[PDB]
Amino acid sequence: KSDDEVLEAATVVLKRCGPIEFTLSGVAKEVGLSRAALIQRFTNRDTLLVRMMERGVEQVRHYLNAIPIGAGPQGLWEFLQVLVRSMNTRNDFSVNYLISWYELQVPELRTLAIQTNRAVVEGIRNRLPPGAPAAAELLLHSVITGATMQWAVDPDGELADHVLAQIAAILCLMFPEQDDFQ
Amino acid sequence: LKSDDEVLEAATVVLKRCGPIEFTLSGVAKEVGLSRAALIQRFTNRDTLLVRMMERGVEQVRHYLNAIPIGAGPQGLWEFLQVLVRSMNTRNDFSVNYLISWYELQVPELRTLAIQTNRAVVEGIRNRLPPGAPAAAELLLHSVITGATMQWAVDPDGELADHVLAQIAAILCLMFPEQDDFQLL
Numbered sequence A: 001k002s003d004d005e006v007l008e009a010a011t012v013v014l015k016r017c018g019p020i021e022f023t024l025s026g027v028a029k030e031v032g033l034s035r036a037a038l039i040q041r042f043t044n045r046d047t048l049l050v051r052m053m054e055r056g057v058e059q060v061r062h063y064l065n066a067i068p069i070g071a072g073p074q075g076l077w078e079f080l081q082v083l084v085r086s087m088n089t090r091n092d093f094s095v096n097y098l099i100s101w102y103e104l105q106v107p108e109l110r111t112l113a114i115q116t117n118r119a120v121v122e123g124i125r126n127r128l129p130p131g132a133p134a135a136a137e138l139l140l141h142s143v144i145t146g147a148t149m150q151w152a153v154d155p156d157g158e159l160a161d162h163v164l165a166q167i168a169a170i171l172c173l174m175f176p177e178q179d180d181f182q
Numbered sequence B: 001l002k003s004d005d006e007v008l009e010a011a012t013v014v015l016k017r018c019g020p021i022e023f024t025l026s027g028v029a030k031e032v033g034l035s036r037a038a039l040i041q042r043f044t045n046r047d048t049l050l051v052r053m054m055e056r057g058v059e060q061v062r063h064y065l066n067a068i069p070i071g072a073g074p075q076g077l078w079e080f081l082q083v084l085v086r087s088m089n090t091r092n093d094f095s096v097n098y099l100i101s102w103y104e105l106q107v108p109e110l111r112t113l114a115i116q117t118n119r120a121v122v123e124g125i126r127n128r129l130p131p132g133a134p135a136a137a138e139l140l141l142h143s144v145i146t147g148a149t150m151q152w153a154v155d156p157d158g159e160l161a162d163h164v165l166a167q168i169a170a171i172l173c174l175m176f177p178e179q180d181d182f183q184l185l
């Protein structure tokens, strides 16, 4: 078992037990090792969460760089569709808001939450066609963020359908010289 | 000595201070100045007190939104949104809002009230849309406020309201091109 593989296993545990009940003992039974082994490789649960979020930042950047780039506003629309539809709601999605809140209470994790968000914002900024409004990347990131929490509180249909309806609405406003976003 | 509404107010202080997980009747008792037994006599237990708190919250949101001065056209919308955004006090227990929200989604009786609460904000925004505003504009505007606020909460720079209203002005400018400029005031 490699350090990377146990970090992925820990991600499973975090999304299942939440950050409060996240423990080395739980990560061990998941990946199939001992607590003493994890304390040797990661010291404590706080450092394991740090290493997990560090890998998360790299994984965000890797995933955003992988999505093909189409032409113009339509390519931006295509990019946002893939990004949003990637959010898995097969299981309880609300645990991720506890993870977020918890991370912001721990300074080193808060820094990594910042880097995670800046990576997504930068990924969107680099896909902006010419002529897009200033700081358009921030407004688009806010729509995804806000519309997702909207649905998380008051779910109606699929998460992606709720979010992308609003993304299409604001893209139509940003790029009125286009036909339409469907 | 201390009315039910006074109890709900003190309980809200405890909730914002301690969060929904460490929230206890003993804490509310200490804050409001009644015995825990008196609170049990009147609210049964901590969970039921939380429900009553969120029921009151739904009415308070609607009354607050209704009371914001009523203006005309896109400018009236812009003015209403400025007041709504500036009402969030980031120096009075703000991060706890996100733990409260998560918690509410775990308790069905509370989640129903969180849904009513968000729907009251969306409808209050809809009630200030001028004729000719895009369909579903209220949901988009609510998402920008909600999303820009969490954006700032994670990665703050400057004041929350300036961060959020910069994006509201930008989207309003796109919603109403005929309009002149959406400036702060």
Ligand SMILES: CC[C@H]1OC(=O)[C@H](C)[C@@H](O[C@H]2C[C@@](C)(OC)[C@@H](O)[C@H](C)O2)[C@H](C)[C@@H](O[C@@H]2O[C@H](C)C[C@H](N(C)C)[C@H]2O)[C@](C)(OC)C[C@@H](C)C(=O)[C@H](C)[C@@H](O)[C@]1(C)O
Pocket: A011, A056, A057, A059, A060, A061, A063, A083, A084, A086, A087, A088, A096, A097, A100, A116, A117, A120, A141, A144, A145, A148
């Ligand atoms: C709280 C609310 C926020 O939710 C979260 O933090 C989730 C729980 C993430 O998973 C967390 C947990 C995690 C294990 O992903 C499941 C971790 O990898 C990721 C960094 O953050 C997501 C699902 C990430 O997507 C995932 O990013 C991965 C790099 C690859 C995944 N997929 C294989 C292509 C992809 O779906 C994503 C980048 O958010 C940042 C999605 C992107 C649209 C956003 O930035 C969103 C606006 C989010 O900030 C959010 C909805 O506001």
Ligand SMILES: CC[C@H]1OC(=O)[C@H](C)[C@@H](O[C@H]2C[C@@](C)(OC)[C@@H](O)[C@H](C)O2)[C@H](C)[C@@H](O[C@@H]2O[C@H](C)C[C@H](N(C)C)[C@H]2O)[C@](C)(OC)C[C@@H](C)C(=O)[C@H](C)[C@@H](O)[C@]1(C)O
Pocket: B012, B016, B053, B054, B056, B057, B058, B060, B061, B064, B084, B085, B087, B088, B097, B098, B100, B101, B117, B118, B121, B145, B146, B149
């Ligand atoms: C998760 C993040 C979200 O936070 C919450 O939902 C909290 C958990 C709320 O407290 C919940 C729980 C509650 C007990 O308050 C703490 C309850 O009273 C309230 C109705 O909703 C808020 C703080 C409410 O404000 C409160 O509204 C009250 C009418 C008066 C309060 N104060 C005296 C000026 C004021 O702070 C408010 C109406 O949101 C809906 C703020 C309004 C600007 C929004 O809609 C925001 C976009 C929010 O949705 C949010 C930032 O996205």
